[PDB]
């Protein structure tokens, strides 16, 4: 009759079973040819160890009993028909941890030679060992463990849809401008056979990934060295005035609070800490000894009425150092009195002249090393940056 | 017979597989008819670059299998019926990252000419390449890939349902008052084929959004400018005090402070920095040459017992800038030794004085061309935002 | 026979077709009759501009195929029937954005006489133009337009259950003691037409809702009054102490953390400012003009060896400002010079006396305005609560 | 024949239809006994005011249609067979706003005599009327309203399963080690009526549940008497040394911000406020009564060349309020002058000591009394927190 | 006939009822063979006690029914059948108080001997009585309660599906490098019965699990530590200086916002405390005694015009404890009045110099013991560590 390829529809699919593995003779294998394109980067979860990614994929099999000639059908070479009403193999991921809500799709394509070609992208919230060890710069393995999560080798064998290499360059539509970015996505087919005489069909898919340093350096390095170039501004506050410790001490707590926050960023990971800990506490304690010298020149220069300068450090430091940084009536028992008492006070101040004078050139001197020290660390920040 | 309607309605739909695609000629493609209504915006994630929206959606297409004469069916033009027992086209966005749920919809329209017409509102989640340059004043650029997800372009075809500038044009209904402001939606229909004789159907919808610049305003400069007109009366307090540092090391604190929680506010996009940065850290450099001029005018004047004003740096100060800025008994021994000390006191108060008389020219000289550079960096801040 | 009322259920359901429009005569329309019992506001985002509500739901139609007759059927009355076995119209809101998860109703009543009563709860997360202004006082108007989303006027109408004073007035049971407090739900019927003789069924629902101003009073003013309270004790606090102002700048630092944390209370909305921030601004702006006078009175007395007071403002300040606020040897040349250099301090002291004196004379009359002014900006704050 | 007891699962389900109500005499209502078990308190959002728990519910009803006879059919006693292949009452609950997805149940126990017994748990997200007034020690009330949504006293009628002492005894297993601490759960039988001879069929369960006040000790009094001990000890930190007030007034900053963290504790229940606040509130006013004795006592002792302690106020404190707290030449001309101004430095100076006299009598006297102020008010604190 | 072995697959599943449960004789238990592998451990809420993980399951069961012989069937052995086709126990778990979505497998493979072995992963969100006890060091016990949800011990029994202690020591596929580290999971087969004669299969299965105490030493310790080698520095620092305080107190305020971030750390079990605060309010307390020494010197110390040091307390301190830290005209009456007021300053100097004395050798030893306690405190630290 003429009334439509209906007629083909009708004839294929009358008695067909979809719940029996599609194949005339049942020794031989259902070769499941697959293919993926990397769509996007979701969401990395460092602290739970889950990549939640989106992939294209795709599905290629052979199904021998709905295979018929172009001719008296009238050369009709595909057909769409509704996926629920065929067989279809149940690939999947062994890293599933969670179910992402995907679009179904509904239809598969069929060619009059039984291949069947079925397209459906997919949501994968999968779980990845993740190394967040030098965590700006960083390069991520997650593995994507395709497989039949029953079937033998007997029955489902796994292949790849096209030539390795172009997958592996396939940059072919990727969302950029995100939090990060594809450099290859490298195929690797085995055979996994968790029990003797038992194989099952695996494809494994090493997708490796950059994370881009851009969004880390201006909220980690920026606010840090904004504290850095206000402290050395802070040293040439005099120690004397009482202010010296009430400047860094402010700076100290603003620093407490900064680590505390950007806490807060870095995960939960229990395997350690990240290696910029290393790049943060080395500046933490640097503010120590810091502060360390701030209240040690505190001790030194007070006026509380105590011991003269020894003229073995007044060498070493007034002298040595110093160059070095550089390049009858009974009225006269009264009167005898009141100098007496008026050059203590005039002594005193003696005292506190010269050991005001040994801190200053003290706190310029050790000023001076701090700021070589800070140039050289940031010297080397920025060549380490440069590599 | 005389029932109802009710005939027509099996007569049609008896043998009627919704599986096979509608056409009596197999050559023939089925075109579909889009028409897009944007609905709502419900929300960027900058973070992730993913825009949700809620779409009023629309499908025309045509099956010549249901059509029927209105002669002998009781004058019947059009007829409802169930969409899960019809063929339909599986037109779905290839920005799909996720599903959002969205009511189901079971009918469809039908007319006698046969020609299916299927409304449903869509809840898409779809990835969008945003560019969070000019941050306040940003147009963002989103595109929404309409395809069939496999059929060809001999079998579904894309095309508009009415012409082309009215949708662009269409701001009826949208819910404005909100975090966004719809300009246009501008359709654009493309052949794309990313195999060679195999092109798949496409029609591009770039639908352009601004952002109204109010929350973001009150938000961002109102603290900004306060911590600006505070600071201002701070330089009135004079540094011998000791209070000088004190304000504004505190304020400086609370400017620390105020970065890091508005730093939250701005996305972890990975693309670099926001252009409101350089808007920000000005101000931010701004308070540290303040910060600057701070501790270098409590380090000229202070109470140290050491040098006296050079005559050199007098004349430049105390005297150029200043209009610049304006416009037989032994008791002689003791006695003499007295006033001996107690003109060295008097001396080193001399010292206090006129150090202390330039730092104050200097504090109102340096005062003044601060408080003339905000106000000239606010007449910059005024013009941009009116420009 | 006699084995049920069993055999009614299948006779009626026998070939009853569920896909069919339900009426004999197909131009005469199906009248849906809706009821609304408005049953919890669930919670508002100010934020996208999404209200979730849940609702007490029920339809009413006519079914004129599944009539019969009270008799030979053992008297039966009405019959319960699986809803997915019986037509079912498909009104739902044009506002939706999303889908809630309501329990599916498995059944329906049927009466003889073909009447469908169909009761259902559902979830409705509906955006919802909001106005914010007036923040702890405010009315909030949202939408609730119910239509059938395709059918016409000569298919399905739209009509009330009941008198529509009773559903306005109906405050049976709605869960108080929550953030919103049900004022009325009120009905509207509309006939909506987006196109030329193609007109759809509408009927909108305004419901107006109320806040409850009590949270936000305590979180508000509560820590905002208690601000001011510090502050007032604080002015008594000597500014030559040098105190002064490590008193006032903490509390601004304070002030200025306190409203950052509560800057996260009022919206992210897009349409400006709240009005609650000009009730709290002013008292910003209140701190300011206090700050503004402590450091003024800390530059006026200080001890820094300059100017002795004007006699112009001698009169103005310390006379009419203070009734207004109560209201041959050679010995002799070296004596001569001690008390000379001694009455130079003496008279720096006069110095210090009289710039003290006219200082806290001045503090007091400051502070009496500022007193009045906060109790006067008082009086008007609780005259606007009682209004 | 002799292949199973499937014969029987045949003869039984061949024409059962699930559709109609389970009577041979319509007539006579389906008895529904119903049990509960409440399995676990998941979260209370006093915010939203919902409750959401779990349940391991019961069901049991009478169908006569499907009784059969022991008797040759092997002697079998009960059969389970698919719950979606026979009827199933819709029992949910009226104070249901949401949907909890709990595991579904395929099965159900058949017995010969034709009971239905469906076992199946379910997760309920429910809004409940809370009264969260005693924060700490709070029971609360609320509601499980079991009912069949739509059908009547008739058709459908409410019944225990078991004696209602148990259940309410019952606390056989329920997750201890929780948030909350179960003691009783209330059955009640009651018939609603919200229709004119229409009464629809409800039992209500009252669970009473306890918090248990432990996590919100620690974390409301112990920083909060840590904040009073460290105030006591600074107490002892005298007024003139300056530091005073810097003491207090970094500590009233650090209750501020402890205040406002801790504000997010305490829901947004529009109810107004805890009672907690009045036990808090007061400590923030025991405060604010500290730092106005602190500021008194600074403007008391200060060396500001003012006025000489008052004789009547001096016996009442330097007097009666210590012992209560305890149990020809010109030279001469020159050399007058010098004294005289000497004097009168030792003059404000014997006005400086006496002043610092009276005010550190006066610190310690209301030192005494603040002391014993806390510790009475501590000791109300334990009485209370015993009973 | 020959078409392929889907005769077979018609055969047996022609009359199959997937409703009943598969015995000839109904008196036999169809015996579910039960198996475990614990893929991850995703997170654990603490505040809510609630564990999710993931696991790879297994069941096996006996259909007698689908039973067939290899011969003239091709020698088939094995063949794959739709799950939702055939009969499958309920099994799930009792401590469920939610569903994880998981994919759902479509087949099920079935031998010649009636045998079928079902393949599953599933997400179980499960309830667990946890110990937080030993917040670092914690071991922690939840349980898997395997039921068949009703089936009686003559329906199904339980049991292992091979010997119990290799799953014990299964660590095969488990994702390291996580929060959680897996010991073993341990098996144990149980009779519960809630009623009388009415018992239901049970299988236990304790999985311990131990945390990986590393992200809490660093987020923990470190910043405390840091806090503490901060303060050692501080003592150093005079008390006359006026500082003294100013460090501390900023110091303390540092510490009571510190332990209020780190107060989100540990969960709102409602169990009492963690032990973790006696490890740190001990730290707490150490600040406070510390704070006490503080203004204890600061009391002691000061210029008031007061007492002189009494002997029995300078012998005990200024030689006792030093050693043991170590180890006619009338110009006349004029002149005798200037040095006697003269000497009254002096006098109050040597005041000044006594106390100021005693309490540096003061602050000396009650520095001496604090630094050897905070040592003696930190060596048991980290003996504690290393145990
Ligand atoms: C319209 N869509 C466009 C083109 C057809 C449809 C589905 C998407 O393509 C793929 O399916 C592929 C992904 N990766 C592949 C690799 C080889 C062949 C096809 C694809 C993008
Ligand atoms: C009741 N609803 C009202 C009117 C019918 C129903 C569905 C909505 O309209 C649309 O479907 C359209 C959206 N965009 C369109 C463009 C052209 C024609 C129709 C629509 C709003
Ligand atoms: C047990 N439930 C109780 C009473 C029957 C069942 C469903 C609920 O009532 C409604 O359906 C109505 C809501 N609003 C209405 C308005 C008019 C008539 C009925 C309702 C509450
Ligand atoms: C294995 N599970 C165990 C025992 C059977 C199965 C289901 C649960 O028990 C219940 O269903 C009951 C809850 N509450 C009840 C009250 C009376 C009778 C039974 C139950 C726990
Ligand atoms: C491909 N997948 C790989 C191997 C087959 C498929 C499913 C997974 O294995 C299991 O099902 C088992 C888990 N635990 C077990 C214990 C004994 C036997 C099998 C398993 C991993």
């Known amino acids: 009759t003429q009334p439509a390829l209906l007629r083909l529809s009708d004839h294929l699919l009358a008695n067909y079973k979809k719940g029996v593995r599609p194949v005339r003779d049942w020794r031989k294998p259902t070769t499941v040819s697959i293919d993926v394109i990397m769509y996007a980067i979701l969401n990395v979860d460092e602290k739970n160890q ?42 999947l991921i062994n890293e599933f941890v969670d179910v992402g809500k995907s679009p179904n799709i509904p239809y598969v ?55 390795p290499e172009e997958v592996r360059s396939d940059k072919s539509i990727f969302i950029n401008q995100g939090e990060w970015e594809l450099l290859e996505v490298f195929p690797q087919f085995k055979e996994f056979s968790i029990d003797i005489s038992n194989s099952y069909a695996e494809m494994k898919f090493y997708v490796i990934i950059r994370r881009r340093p851009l969004f880390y350096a201006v909220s980690l390095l920026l606010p840090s060295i904004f504290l850095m170039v206000v402290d050395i501004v802070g040293f040439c506050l005099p120690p004397d005035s009482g202010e010296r410790v009430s ?18 960023t870095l995960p939960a990971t229990a395997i350690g800490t990240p290696l910029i800990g290393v790049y943060f506490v080395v500046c933490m304690a640097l503010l120590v000894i810091s502060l360390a010298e701030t209240i040690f020149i505190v ?53 506190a002249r010269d050991w005001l004078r040994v801190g200053y050139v003290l706190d310029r001197l050790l000023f001076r090393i701090y700021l070589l020290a800070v140039l050289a660390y940031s010297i080397t920040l920025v060549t380490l940056w440069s590599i």
Chains 1, 2, 3, 4, 5 share one sequence.
């Open 50 to 91: 889950v990549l939640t990614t989106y992939i294209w994929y795709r599905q290629y099999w052979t199904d021998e009993f709905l295979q018929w000639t172009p001719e008296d059908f009238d050369n009709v070479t595909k057909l769409s028909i509704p996926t629920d009403s065929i067989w279809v193999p149940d690939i």
């Open 109 to 163: 394509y069929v060619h009059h030679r039984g291949e069947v070609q079925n397209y459906k992208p997919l949501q994968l919230v999968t779980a990845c060992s993740l190394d967040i060890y030098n965590f700006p710069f960083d390069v991520q393995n997650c593995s994507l463990t395709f497989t039949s999560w029953l079937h033998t080798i007997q029955d489902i064998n796994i292949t790849l849809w096209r030539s």
């Open 247 to 264: 400047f860094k001490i402010t700076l100290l707590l603003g620093y407490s609070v900064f680590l505390i926050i950007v806490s807060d």
């Open 299 to 351: 001790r030194l220069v007070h006026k509380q009425d105590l011991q003269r300068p020894v003229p073995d450090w007044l060498r070493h430091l007034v002298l040595d150092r110093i160059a070095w940084i550089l390049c009858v009536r009974g009225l006269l028992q009264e009167l005898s009195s009141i100098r007496h008492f008026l050059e203590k006070r005039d002594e005193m101040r003696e005292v």
